[PDB]
Amino acid sequence: ERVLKVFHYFESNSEPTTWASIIRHGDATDVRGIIQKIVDSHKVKHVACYGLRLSHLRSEEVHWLHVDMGVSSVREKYELAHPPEEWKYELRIRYLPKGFLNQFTEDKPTLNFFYQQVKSDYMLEIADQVDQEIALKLGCLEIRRSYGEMRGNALEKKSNYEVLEKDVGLKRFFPKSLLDSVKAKTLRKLIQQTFRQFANLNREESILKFFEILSPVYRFDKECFKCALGSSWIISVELAIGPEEGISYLTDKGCNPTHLADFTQVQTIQYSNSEDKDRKGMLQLKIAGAPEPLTVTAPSLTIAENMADLIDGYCRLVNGTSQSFIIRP
Amino acid sequence: ERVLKVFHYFESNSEPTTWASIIRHGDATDVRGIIQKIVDSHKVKHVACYGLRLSHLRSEEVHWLHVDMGVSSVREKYELAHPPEEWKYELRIRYLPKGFLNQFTEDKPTLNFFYQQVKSDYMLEIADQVDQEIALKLGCLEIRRSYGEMRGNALEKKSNYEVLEKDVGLKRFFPKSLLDSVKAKTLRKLIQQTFRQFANLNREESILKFFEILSPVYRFDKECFKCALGSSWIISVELAIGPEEGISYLTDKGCNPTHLADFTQVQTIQYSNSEDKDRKGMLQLKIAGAPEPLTVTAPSLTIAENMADLIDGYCRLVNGTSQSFIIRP
């Protein structure tokens, strides 16, 4: 019996980068058990949406650990390639229900977890590069969510503004790209003016306004994979996997998808090693009412495996099961 | 926190009318929760196909319990009217996908569950009234399925045929209608003669040929309801609801249906009491691309409620949600 530190996105009054839970487990404990123990602690309704992402701290290596995998078997395997201080385990929401935001507002621990997760990704990945009107609104909205006391024109008084700027930092709400490039108090005639259009909202209306604003410049509701379809004339595409498109491919005309299969039609999921000279990842989906299986060639076995995990998650969610649709050969 | 006895169709080597599960539930458990607790044990994939039927033993009263209803609230209501020993709760497959047989072969616990359920209904409802050629093959196919070690030339020998007479029982495979009207040894010239055409079939092929033969004389892939359509000039019809017709009404020509809507078109379901002469149940479906709702007028609220459950089950199955399409005004 050992213990495991899982970073997660359930908020407390500490600093975001320290949010975590230490879970102790046996050699029969699987990843599903780890997940239920952490969220049940927070009275989460939508347990089936959560998964466990293992990232290598010193590269781009990432493994989504399947709910059926044993934690000890997993911890034993990945500690061979790298030392324990080189791995980060985080709980993320990965499998979204159809109409997830509406369904998440009806389960507020998860609505917030998702909000935290999406905001965090937003900062670490696209906050610096985004239209600075957007970066403003999103920032204002998070201030409005934590500090429900700064109503209407209350940030225009200076003795509350400095509670947010000089000591703690504005970098908690705004990208560094924007806090540097504009002047010390041209920034706050912009913030106080921007704040006014959201000053009336409670926190839940703020969380939802956050998503409305962010979605058109950052699709957090899907995952895309560069890969190739076919068993004879292999064509390379960008697959889009998500709640409202099922399995789709991008047709160069934005993230707007062309449909391929519904999760309800996927009967079996299968992923192997590429039988030849390169180390590509293979993926086969048996689709109902379709003679040919859907064959996917991914750049690596790691990526094939991560994709199988995403598709199995939606399959489980869309039927009402805990049983995996993945098989062996 | 109480216990509940749910009859079902997962086979064990006990006696068939005694197959059941005792599930423990609290006062937050919904029907969906009961169903999950029963099926997860058997690695069932298509959980969204299952529903829960409550029948009163001392009348013809039947209530389909909606997955969102809470078990204890339901159970309190019907235990007011009659004591527990007069109620039977059975898990049933009620919502079928298009190409359901094909879909079930890739989830054999359900294929087996469905077979048992359909075979049971057959014996309890129409086995006695069906052409005795049909009764012969159907009875035989269960034998070829039940004893998977016994090959084709094994029933022609007299000393194992009576292993099925004296110990197991012939009433287990054939209607009493047939075991009585033909004599003991004209009947085995009949069983042995019929059995030979199915001797190569394994268990999966036995089940599928069972459905193949049964389907033309007993529709187990649909439900029919006597009711009336329209909001003004009410016409009385027989609705036929199922995977291969969606919502249809019958028009004189057998169970041969006229199409009305596909489940994918159903936007909202709404069912209330008739403010009119009888305690009729009203049922309104908003259909996409039709300005006018489809109004269904049923003989009682109970039938209206049972129809709402069927249509909602299919709406959930066909889209991929747990979210109900039933709205409550």
XYZ file of C-alpha atoms in Angstrom:
658
model
C 0.000 0.000 0.000
C 1.504 3.300 -1.276
C 0.282 6.885 -1.822
C -0.199 8.999 -4.974
C -0.341 12.759 -5.485
C -2.953 13.779 -8.035
C -3.189 17.407 -9.100
C -6.762 18.450 -9.758
C -9.005 21.459 -10.286
C -11.257 21.529 -7.273
C -10.680 25.034 -5.897
C -9.586 25.917 -2.379
C -8.188 29.170 -0.927
C -4.611 28.199 -1.775
C -2.748 28.960 -5.011
C -4.015 27.049 -8.116
C -0.752 25.207 -8.804
C -0.982 23.463 -5.399
C -4.495 22.048 -5.721
C -4.148 18.299 -5.187
C -5.065 15.213 -3.169
C -2.963 12.384 -1.740
C -4.646 9.044 -2.313
C -3.454 5.743 -0.878
C -4.030 2.549 -2.848
C -3.299 -1.201 -3.197
C -2.160 -3.536 -6.014
C -5.740 -4.182 -7.122
C -6.636 -0.509 -7.156
C -7.397 0.623 -10.680
C -7.513 4.205 -12.035
C -11.322 4.224 -11.781
C -10.990 3.768 -8.006
C -8.508 6.651 -7.706
C -10.915 8.896 -9.604
C -14.068 7.972 -7.615
C -12.211 8.505 -4.331
C -11.110 12.054 -5.318
C -14.387 13.324 -6.752
C -16.704 11.567 -4.254
C -14.823 13.642 -1.714
C -16.322 16.688 -3.484
C -19.865 15.311 -3.938
C -19.524 15.105 -7.760
C -22.506 13.768 -9.734
C -20.945 13.280 -13.192
C -18.222 10.789 -12.339
C -18.060 9.354 -15.846
C -16.640 12.573 -17.298
C -13.335 12.437 -15.412
C -10.101 10.799 -16.499
C -6.466 10.706 -15.422
C -3.685 12.352 -17.441
C -0.044 11.483 -16.769
C 2.400 13.997 -18.202
C 6.188 13.907 -18.369
C 7.467 17.136 -16.836
C 10.600 17.237 -18.973
C 9.040 16.706 -22.457
C 5.781 16.606 -24.401
C 5.106 12.956 -23.463
C 1.550 12.464 -22.232
C -0.395 9.310 -21.362
C -4.092 9.096 -20.604
C -4.419 6.238 -18.117
C -7.446 4.010 -18.823
C -10.044 3.629 -16.075
C -9.564 -0.161 -16.147
C -5.741 -0.062 -15.723
C -4.253 -0.958 -12.351
C -2.563 1.975 -10.630
C 0.372 -0.104 -9.347
C 0.899 -1.754 -12.747
C 0.833 1.713 -14.284
C 3.095 3.292 -11.691
C 5.574 0.415 -12.043
C 5.696 0.738 -15.882
C 6.170 4.519 -16.290
C 8.675 4.821 -13.449
C 10.980 2.592 -15.530
C 11.319 5.167 -18.306
C 11.634 8.071 -15.851
C 12.017 8.871 -12.068
C 8.988 9.698 -9.829
C 9.971 13.389 -9.506
C 9.720 13.505 -13.322
C 5.963 12.544 -13.488
C 2.845 14.668 -12.881
C -0.524 13.013 -12.431
C -3.560 15.265 -12.991
C -7.296 14.653 -12.875
C -9.043 16.294 -15.830
C -12.515 16.341 -17.376
C -12.098 14.585 -20.711
C -15.407 13.000 -21.691
C -18.151 15.578 -22.102
C -21.865 14.808 -22.023
C -23.963 15.999 -24.924
C -24.988 19.540 -23.898
C -22.333 19.455 -21.163
C -22.458 23.077 -19.907
C -26.193 22.936 -19.258
C -25.795 19.540 -17.722
C -22.792 20.745 -15.628
C -24.690 23.740 -14.120
C -26.927 21.138 -12.493
C -23.880 19.686 -10.704
C -21.939 22.725 -9.470
C -18.769 20.965 -8.171
C -18.097 19.783 -11.769
C -19.176 23.082 -13.385
C -16.485 24.801 -11.376
C -13.848 22.078 -11.882
C -14.393 22.378 -15.608
C -14.253 26.189 -15.354
C -10.976 25.939 -13.454
C -9.496 23.469 -15.933
C -10.471 25.473 -18.993
C -9.281 28.784 -17.514
C -5.933 27.243 -16.550
C -5.408 25.807 -20.073
C -6.457 29.191 -21.435
C -3.694 30.976 -19.454
C -0.950 28.406 -20.233
C -1.640 28.091 -23.941
C -3.506 30.904 -25.742
C -3.954 33.837 -23.355
C -0.792 35.645 -24.572
C -1.709 35.354 -28.231
C -5.386 36.286 -28.157
C -7.170 39.523 -29.245
C -6.668 41.828 -26.299
C -10.343 42.691 -26.128
C -10.943 38.981 -25.331
C -8.112 38.745 -22.780
C -9.725 41.695 -21.018
C -13.270 40.318 -20.804
C -12.114 36.899 -19.615
C -9.940 38.475 -16.950
C -12.732 40.764 -15.763
C -15.090 37.800 -15.512
C -12.782 35.820 -13.174
C -12.374 38.862 -10.903
C -16.179 39.154 -10.858
C -16.407 35.480 -9.884
C -14.007 35.387 -6.871
C -14.803 38.914 -5.675
C -18.585 39.240 -5.668
C -18.162 42.439 -3.625
C -16.830 44.647 -6.454
C -20.295 45.500 -7.895
C -21.087 48.072 -10.637
C -18.688 51.011 -10.363
C -16.832 49.705 -7.275
C -13.510 49.007 -8.992
C -13.287 52.668 -10.036
C -12.507 53.522 -6.407
C -8.722 53.098 -5.953
C -8.667 51.532 -2.471
C -10.141 48.272 -3.738
C -8.148 48.187 -6.984
C -4.795 48.063 -5.166
C -5.985 44.973 -3.266
C -5.716 43.289 -6.674
C -2.636 44.893 -8.263
C 0.534 45.740 -6.226
C 0.687 42.950 -3.604
C -0.946 39.761 -4.901
C -0.774 40.472 -8.678
C -2.941 41.104 -11.750
C -1.126 38.184 -13.445
C -3.771 35.950 -11.759
C -6.480 37.194 -14.128
C -4.551 38.541 -17.086
C -1.945 37.273 -19.568
C 1.594 38.669 -19.183
C 1.390 39.815 -22.829
C -1.145 42.439 -21.823
C 0.071 43.532 -18.355
C 3.458 44.548 -19.847
C 2.553 46.046 -23.260
C 0.070 48.647 -22.010
C 0.872 51.420 -19.447
C 0.290 51.250 -15.661
C -3.058 53.117 -15.561
C -4.136 52.954 -19.226
C -4.599 49.333 -18.204
C -7.040 50.227 -15.470
C -9.107 52.701 -17.468
C -9.547 49.682 -19.758
C -10.259 47.223 -16.951
C -12.761 49.403 -15.079
C -14.522 50.231 -18.362
C -14.553 46.564 -19.415
C -15.670 45.412 -15.970
C -18.865 47.425 -16.266
C -20.507 45.136 -18.813
C -20.204 42.132 -16.422
C -20.396 43.910 -13.038
C -24.010 42.807 -12.495
C -23.468 39.013 -12.928
C -23.241 36.458 -10.090
C -20.534 33.809 -10.281
C -22.426 31.153 -12.203
C -23.563 33.696 -14.847
C -19.877 34.689 -15.002
C -18.567 31.154 -15.522
C -21.017 30.704 -18.406
C -20.101 34.079 -19.873
C -16.495 33.014 -19.678
C -17.178 29.990 -21.849
C -19.324 31.912 -24.330
C -16.550 34.378 -24.936
C -13.665 31.863 -25.032
C -15.257 29.168 -27.225
C -14.953 31.028 -30.574
C -11.165 31.446 -30.193
C -10.375 28.241 -28.319
C -12.401 25.061 -28.705
C -12.211 23.372 -25.303
C -15.081 21.118 -26.210
C -13.165 18.719 -28.451
C -9.813 17.161 -29.137
C -8.155 17.084 -32.546
C -5.626 14.567 -33.826
C -3.403 14.726 -36.885
C -3.519 11.217 -38.392
C -4.510 9.136 -41.442
C -7.660 7.173 -42.456
C -7.909 4.015 -44.579
C -6.570 0.519 -45.150
C -5.593 0.966 -48.862
C -5.352 4.594 -50.004
C -4.312 6.129 -46.682
C -5.399 9.806 -46.580
C -4.047 12.135 -43.921
C -6.682 14.157 -42.032
C -7.186 16.003 -38.784
C -9.702 14.041 -36.708
C -12.016 16.009 -34.411
C -13.410 14.056 -31.472
C -16.051 15.565 -29.227
C -19.580 15.621 -27.773
C -21.452 17.301 -30.609
C -19.625 15.930 -33.670
C -18.802 12.438 -32.509
C -15.891 11.363 -34.641
C -15.274 13.944 -37.362
C -12.478 15.252 -39.545
C -11.524 18.877 -40.181
C -11.962 20.046 -43.715
C -9.495 22.931 -43.597
C -12.480 25.314 -43.188
C -11.753 25.883 -39.469
C -12.490 23.483 -36.585
C -15.929 23.021 -38.230
C -16.279 19.259 -38.729
C -17.442 16.789 -41.378
C -19.080 13.825 -39.700
C -17.749 10.234 -39.757
C -19.346 8.186 -37.002
C -21.532 8.531 -33.945
C -20.276 7.210 -30.660
C -23.507 5.098 -30.508
C -22.330 3.223 -33.634
C -18.869 2.263 -32.363
C -19.082 -1.431 -31.432
C -15.413 -2.254 -30.748
C -12.208 -0.254 -30.276
C -8.773 -1.598 -31.080
C -5.249 -0.262 -31.049
C -1.923 -1.917 -31.924
C 1.655 -1.286 -33.044
C 2.387 -0.562 -36.742
C 3.569 -3.826 -38.203
C 6.359 -2.247 -40.207
C 9.603 -0.246 -40.129
C 8.226 2.988 -38.568
C 6.727 3.197 -35.113
C 3.241 4.384 -35.972
C 0.168 3.741 -33.840
C -2.694 1.850 -35.396
C -6.428 2.272 -34.386
C -9.407 0.256 -35.644
C -13.063 1.010 -34.924
C -15.753 -1.530 -35.788
C -18.720 0.666 -36.751
C -22.274 -0.659 -36.751
C -23.914 -1.085 -40.155
C -20.582 -0.499 -41.852
C -18.821 -3.368 -43.628
C -15.332 -1.885 -43.405
C -13.740 -1.020 -40.079
C -12.530 2.571 -39.657
C -8.692 2.390 -39.779
C -6.611 5.160 -38.227
C -2.847 5.522 -38.456
C -1.469 7.748 -35.775
C 2.110 9.071 -35.568
C 2.828 6.810 -32.551
C 1.450 4.028 -30.340
C 1.164 6.585 -27.533
C -1.191 8.733 -29.641
C -3.207 5.742 -30.885
C -3.625 4.732 -27.240
C -4.644 8.230 -26.179
C -7.235 8.344 -28.960
C -8.648 4.895 -28.056
C -9.064 6.204 -24.508
C -10.982 9.273 -25.713
C -13.301 7.241 -27.925
C -13.880 4.601 -25.219
C -14.792 7.383 -22.787
C -17.521 8.725 -25.080
C -18.716 5.202 -25.836
C -19.140 4.467 -22.126
C -20.869 7.827 -21.542
C -23.304 7.502 -24.484
C -24.448 3.991 -23.630
C -24.857 3.933 -19.869
C -21.896 1.701 -19.028
C -18.770 1.185 -16.967
C -17.680 -1.578 -19.386
C -14.933 -0.762 -21.896
C -15.351 -1.222 -25.641
C -11.588 -1.736 -26.172
C -10.339 -5.271 -27.010
C -6.928 -7.058 -27.520
C -5.764 -7.911 -31.094
C -32.070 2.767 3.150
C -34.119 -0.319 2.093
C -33.778 -3.424 -0.135
C -35.577 -4.121 -3.414
C -36.155 -7.365 -5.329
C -35.847 -6.984 -9.119
C -36.570 -9.960 -11.375
C -34.423 -10.204 -14.475
C -33.169 -12.452 -17.284
C -29.462 -12.987 -16.625
C -29.184 -16.785 -16.716
C -27.783 -18.904 -13.922
C -28.156 -22.644 -13.324
C -31.084 -22.142 -10.950
C -34.766 -22.193 -11.968
C -35.742 -19.544 -14.593
C -38.745 -17.887 -12.821
C -36.395 -17.348 -9.820
C -33.680 -15.322 -11.602
C -33.477 -12.040 -9.707
C -31.256 -9.663 -7.725
C -31.654 -7.998 -4.349
C -30.435 -4.411 -4.648
C -29.909 -2.094 -1.764
C -30.918 1.510 -2.235
C -31.192 4.692 -0.229
C -33.517 7.611 -0.528
C -31.447 9.313 -3.272
C -31.217 6.345 -5.628
C -33.037 6.783 -8.957
C -34.260 3.979 -11.237
C -31.171 4.500 -13.377
C -29.205 3.631 -10.244
C -31.128 0.394 -9.650
C -30.587 -0.618 -13.299
C -26.830 0.102 -13.141
C -26.382 -1.870 -9.920
C -28.076 -4.911 -11.484
C -26.315 -4.809 -14.854
C -22.749 -3.753 -13.950
C -22.179 -7.186 -12.433
C -22.628 -8.736 -15.903
C -20.388 -6.412 -17.955
C -23.453 -5.207 -19.957
C -22.533 -2.699 -22.730
C -25.893 -1.358 -23.963
C -27.290 -0.161 -20.603
C -29.474 2.471 -22.275
C -31.656 -0.305 -23.685
C -32.900 -1.345 -20.243
C -35.937 -0.133 -18.343
C -37.807 -1.137 -15.185
C -41.386 -2.472 -15.268
C -43.529 -2.628 -12.131
C -46.512 -5.028 -12.396
C -49.333 -5.623 -9.913
C -49.849 -9.341 -9.455
C -53.574 -9.044 -8.623
C -54.630 -7.120 -11.728
C -53.516 -6.056 -15.173
C -52.030 -2.770 -13.827
C -48.521 -2.056 -15.220
C -46.208 0.899 -14.683
C -42.928 1.581 -16.495
C -40.650 3.400 -14.063
C -38.734 6.320 -15.603
C -34.961 6.305 -15.070
C -35.012 9.762 -13.424
C -37.650 8.860 -10.815
C -36.402 8.106 -7.329
C -36.891 4.501 -6.229
C -38.103 5.200 -2.705
C -40.646 7.847 -3.771
C -41.993 5.434 -6.405
C -42.085 2.546 -3.988
C -43.872 4.568 -1.281
C -46.636 5.462 -3.734
C -47.422 2.003 -4.939
C -47.001 0.393 -1.493
C -49.847 2.644 -0.289
C -52.229 0.996 -2.764
C -51.164 -2.636 -2.223
C -48.652 -4.501 0.013
C -45.157 -5.426 -1.263
C -45.951 -9.083 -1.892
C -48.450 -7.958 -4.567
C -45.822 -6.033 -6.676
C -43.259 -7.486 -9.082
C -40.312 -5.332 -10.331
C -38.614 -6.685 -13.431
C -35.685 -5.423 -15.403
C -36.528 -5.535 -19.070
C -35.052 -4.546 -22.397
C -37.461 -1.919 -23.712
C -35.579 0.453 -26.044
C -34.121 -1.209 -29.171
C -31.472 0.292 -31.532
C -31.830 -0.004 -35.330
C -30.270 -3.343 -36.238
C -30.601 -4.444 -32.631
C -29.775 -8.124 -33.126
C -26.627 -7.252 -34.973
C -25.721 -4.737 -32.278
C -26.394 -7.189 -29.487
C -24.021 -9.925 -30.828
C -21.132 -7.637 -29.897
C -22.490 -7.452 -26.306
C -23.437 -11.048 -25.529
C -24.753 -10.518 -22.000
C -27.499 -8.405 -23.562
C -28.048 -10.778 -26.470
C -28.516 -13.482 -23.881
C -30.684 -11.250 -21.676
C -32.866 -10.294 -24.640
C -33.200 -13.920 -25.791
C -34.315 -15.066 -22.348
C -36.762 -12.175 -22.087
C -38.261 -12.909 -25.514
C -38.393 -16.684 -24.952
C -40.142 -16.136 -21.604
C -42.727 -13.846 -23.150
C -43.240 -16.422 -25.871
C -44.039 -19.286 -23.477
C -46.157 -17.131 -21.164
C -48.257 -15.557 -24.002
C -48.404 -17.337 -27.368
C -46.535 -20.665 -27.276
C -49.813 -22.585 -26.691
C -51.548 -20.830 -29.623
C -48.806 -21.079 -32.272
C -48.493 -23.544 -35.221
C -46.921 -26.650 -33.765
C -44.232 -26.715 -36.407
C -43.037 -23.384 -34.981
C -43.393 -24.652 -31.408
C -41.327 -27.665 -32.450
C -38.358 -25.743 -33.916
C -38.367 -23.081 -31.171
C -38.406 -25.671 -28.423
C -35.585 -27.542 -30.164
C -33.443 -24.432 -30.623
C -33.489 -23.825 -26.849
C -32.300 -27.437 -26.371
C -29.441 -26.938 -28.890
C -28.575 -23.807 -26.920
C -28.967 -25.107 -23.357
C -26.861 -28.275 -23.794
C -23.852 -27.021 -25.731
C -21.855 -30.259 -25.395
C -24.529 -32.498 -26.940
C -23.977 -32.940 -30.732
C -26.442 -33.815 -33.509
C -26.740 -37.615 -33.414
C -27.196 -37.622 -29.654
C -30.961 -37.223 -29.394
C -31.779 -40.202 -31.603
C -30.624 -42.593 -28.867
C -33.327 -43.504 -26.299
C -31.368 -43.253 -23.031
C -30.557 -39.539 -23.163
C -33.937 -38.467 -24.563
C -35.474 -39.536 -21.235
C -32.792 -37.515 -19.400
C -34.872 -34.634 -20.756
C -38.197 -36.265 -19.877
C -37.950 -37.501 -16.276
C -35.376 -35.126 -14.724
C -35.245 -31.737 -16.443
C -38.783 -31.573 -17.854
C -40.262 -31.166 -21.317
C -42.475 -28.308 -20.125
C -39.182 -26.320 -20.058
C -38.897 -26.261 -23.861
C -42.383 -26.889 -25.226
C -45.890 -25.591 -24.527
C -48.251 -27.798 -22.506
C -50.508 -27.455 -25.573
C -48.071 -29.683 -27.501
C -46.905 -32.094 -24.764
C -50.538 -33.194 -24.221
C -52.127 -33.399 -27.687
C -49.455 -35.706 -29.174
C -48.463 -39.023 -27.600
C -45.229 -39.633 -25.755
C -43.502 -41.512 -28.494
C -45.096 -39.880 -31.530
C -43.653 -36.722 -29.985
C -40.050 -37.845 -29.888
C -40.244 -39.057 -33.441
C -41.174 -35.397 -33.818
C -38.419 -33.856 -31.608
C -35.606 -35.995 -32.976
C -36.787 -35.345 -36.542
C -36.997 -31.576 -36.080
C -33.745 -31.285 -34.096
C -31.455 -32.461 -36.912
C -31.750 -29.220 -38.970
C -30.139 -27.179 -36.166
C -27.435 -29.583 -35.050
C -24.393 -27.561 -36.266
C -25.387 -24.289 -34.635
C -23.412 -22.952 -31.666
C -25.158 -20.894 -28.988
C -25.054 -17.562 -30.813
C -26.433 -19.126 -34.030
C -29.159 -20.845 -31.997
C -30.396 -17.623 -30.470
C -30.346 -15.799 -33.836
C -32.204 -18.561 -35.684
C -34.699 -18.553 -32.775
C -35.488 -14.883 -33.412
C -35.555 -15.517 -37.175
C -38.272 -18.132 -36.866
C -40.266 -16.387 -34.139
C -40.404 -12.894 -35.682
C -43.008 -13.613 -38.403
C -45.643 -14.711 -35.838
C -44.893 -12.490 -32.816
C -43.543 -8.933 -32.964
C -41.106 -8.463 -30.086
C -39.355 -5.528 -31.793
C -42.181 -3.011 -31.203
C -45.039 -1.879 -28.982
C -48.587 -0.923 -30.025
C -50.986 1.456 -28.261
C -54.662 2.096 -28.906
C -55.112 5.871 -28.717
C -56.147 8.931 -30.704
C -54.212 11.563 -32.717
C -54.945 15.251 -33.254
C -55.695 18.374 -31.225
C -59.055 19.210 -32.865
C -60.670 16.489 -34.878
C -59.400 13.513 -32.894
C -58.872 10.307 -34.938
C -58.421 7.027 -33.096
C -55.502 4.877 -34.249
C -53.123 2.245 -33.099
C -49.599 3.709 -32.678
C -46.704 1.381 -33.362
C -43.457 2.358 -31.676
C -40.129 0.681 -32.342
C -36.615 0.688 -33.851
C -37.682 0.044 -37.472
C -40.743 2.354 -37.644
C -40.070 5.085 -35.082
C -43.496 6.464 -34.280
C -46.059 4.971 -36.676
C -49.756 4.244 -36.810
C -51.373 1.079 -38.057
C -53.621 1.236 -41.069
C -55.744 -1.944 -41.462
C -52.978 -3.847 -43.207
C -51.643 -5.837 -40.244
C -48.741 -4.533 -38.155
C -47.669 -2.888 -41.494
C -46.985 0.743 -40.395
C -47.354 4.269 -41.742
C -44.480 6.509 -40.666
C -45.093 9.653 -38.591
C -41.738 10.691 -37.088
C -38.272 9.360 -36.390
C -37.046 9.510 -32.806
C -34.237 11.890 -33.884
C -36.882 14.508 -34.726
C -38.429 14.488 -31.268
C -37.554 17.708 -29.517
C -39.844 17.707 -26.489
C -42.233 15.327 -24.719
C -45.011 16.612 -22.495
C -47.754 14.585 -20.782
C -50.604 15.688 -18.547
C -54.175 14.861 -17.499
C -57.222 15.356 -19.708
C -59.271 18.212 -18.225
C -62.228 16.535 -20.011
C -64.868 13.796 -19.625
C -62.668 10.780 -18.789
C -59.371 10.493 -16.922
C -57.567 10.491 -20.286
C -53.831 11.157 -20.570
C -52.642 13.787 -22.965
C -49.255 13.468 -24.705
C -47.610 16.150 -26.848
C -44.488 15.764 -28.925
C -42.797 18.754 -30.499
C -41.333 17.503 -33.781
C -38.491 19.316 -35.558
C -39.579 20.837 -38.819
C -43.277 20.631 -38.003
C -44.838 23.774 -36.473
C -47.693 21.741 -34.983
C -47.152 19.347 -32.061
C -48.258 15.740 -32.412
C -51.019 15.333 -29.811
C -51.722 11.823 -28.551
C -54.789 11.121 -26.432
C -54.536 7.909 -24.381
C -57.280 6.045 -22.401
C -55.649 6.749 -19.017
C -52.786 8.793 -17.577
C -51.018 5.482 -16.861
C -50.913 4.556 -20.531
C -49.904 8.126 -21.392
C -47.126 7.778 -18.799
C -46.023 4.409 -20.201
C -45.920 5.836 -23.749
C -43.893 8.860 -22.594
C -41.378 6.441 -21.049
C -41.002 4.434 -24.259
C -40.578 7.422 -26.513
C -38.134 9.117 -24.078
C -36.054 5.919 -23.828
C -35.655 5.910 -27.599
C -34.933 9.660 -27.702
C -32.140 9.122 -25.145
C -30.846 5.998 -26.949
C -30.780 7.509 -30.397
C -29.146 10.801 -29.441
C -26.504 10.069 -26.949
C -27.831 11.534 -23.714
C -28.957 10.728 -20.268
C -30.785 14.049 -20.388
C -34.560 13.445 -20.568
C -36.680 14.934 -23.356
C -39.641 15.127 -20.979
C -40.502 18.678 -19.884
C -42.840 19.379 -16.972
C -45.589 22.001 -17.524
